[PDB]
Amino acid sequence: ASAWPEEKNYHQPAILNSSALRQIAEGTSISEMWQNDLQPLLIERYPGSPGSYAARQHIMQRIQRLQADWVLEIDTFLSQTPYGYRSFSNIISTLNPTAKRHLVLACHYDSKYFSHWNNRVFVGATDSAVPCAMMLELARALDKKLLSLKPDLSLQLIFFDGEEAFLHWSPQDSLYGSRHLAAKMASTPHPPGARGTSQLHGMDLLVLLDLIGAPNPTFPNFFPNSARWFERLQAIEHELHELGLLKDHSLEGRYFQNYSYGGVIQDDHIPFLRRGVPVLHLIPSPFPEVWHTMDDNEENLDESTIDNLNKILQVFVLEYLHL
Numbered sequence: 001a002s003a004w005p006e007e008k009n010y011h012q013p014a015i016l017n018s019s020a021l022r023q024i025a026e027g028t029s030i031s032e033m034w035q036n037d038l039q040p041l042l043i044e045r046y047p048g049s050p051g052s053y054a055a056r057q058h059i060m061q062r063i064q065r066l067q068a069d070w071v072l073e074i075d076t077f078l079s080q081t082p083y084g085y086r087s088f089s090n091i092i093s094t095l096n097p098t099a100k101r102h103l104v105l106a107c108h109y110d111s112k113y114f115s116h117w118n119n120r121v122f123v124g125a126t127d128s129a130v131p132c133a134m135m136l137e138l139a140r141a142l143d144k145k146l147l148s149l150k151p152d153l154s155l156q157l158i159f160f161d162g163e164e165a166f167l168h169w170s171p172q173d174s175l176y177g178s179r180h181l182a183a184k185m186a187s188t189p190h191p192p193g194a195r196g197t198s199q200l201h202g203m204d205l206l207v208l209l210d211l212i213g214a215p216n217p218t219f220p221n222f223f224p225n226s227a228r229w230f231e232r233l234q235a236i237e238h239e240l241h242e243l244g245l246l247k248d249h250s251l252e253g254r255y256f257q258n259y260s261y262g263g264v265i266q267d268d269h270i271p272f273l274r275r276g277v278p279v280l281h282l283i284p285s286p287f288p289e290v291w292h293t294m295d296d297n298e299e300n301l302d303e304s305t306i307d308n309l310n311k312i313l314q315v316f317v318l319e320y321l322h323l
């Protein structure tokens, strides 16, 4: 084998100080994200649609314009759906693709198809336009610091296609993109030339954002083998609050709760979990009240919650990568 795959286990953050924290909090811009990253994704974008091509062009253009040297790949493939064989396209965004280890942030960019009841269209605002915009705003806000990337450890973004069921949530009608990509990565040697390690060995931590943007979210701590990382989020939130850097935020209504959970919730991280990759699943439970209705729209999102989570996520990635 090789030794580097085990560094994720012992990896520790480079904790940030009061001054840096202020600089992060100030460096992220909620209304720039809103106008430039989010609003254009608030469109119907089910697999194959016009909006899907549009959302993919948007995500890629917004990344390609940054200073950091992001290598974009599209994992396009065909899969059997209840409505025939269809085309799906995962978007992968990697700094230092030959970097042995990556922290991986992920979300899905497709929206669920609903027929247009009452003359309205499902735009999946929490599900997951806001998580996509959060990733793009992260890449923008952190861009100056990501430059530094030129431990062999870097950053990857994954925007999964076809997370949603076409008809009803089941094993063969859901997770089209993550199931394909996990299998692709599993059989691909990493770094190249390697004999016993795959791109999955290189995934330090898979952080999956889903269903983000409603007010008062509460995020359970889901799995045994990722909890110190969850604990870091709890700490970052605490410190950001104490330093007075969150908005409309009370410590009683903390997002990250050391409340444990019964069932896992099925999502794009499952085909990676099944292959033994560590996962931080940032999905709230209860799901937003608007979940899978036409009310999951822009007007029901909460500015301050998203701003706060953005601040917290950007800190977390700065600490994990030692930047």
Ligand SMILES: COc1ccc(NC(=S)NCCCn2ccnc2)cc1OC
Residues within 6 Å of the ligand: 127, 164, 210, 211, 264, 265, 266, 267, 284, 285, 286, 287, 291
């Ligand atoms: C209504 O609240 C729930 C409904 C279902 C589940 N259980 C599962 S396994 N859901 C898989 C969700 C997959 N997905 C993610 C985004 N779009 C679809 C939990 C819920 O509240 C905790």
Ligand SMILES: [Zn+2]
Residues within 6 Å of the ligand: 112, 127, 164, 292
């Ligand atoms: Zn959904």
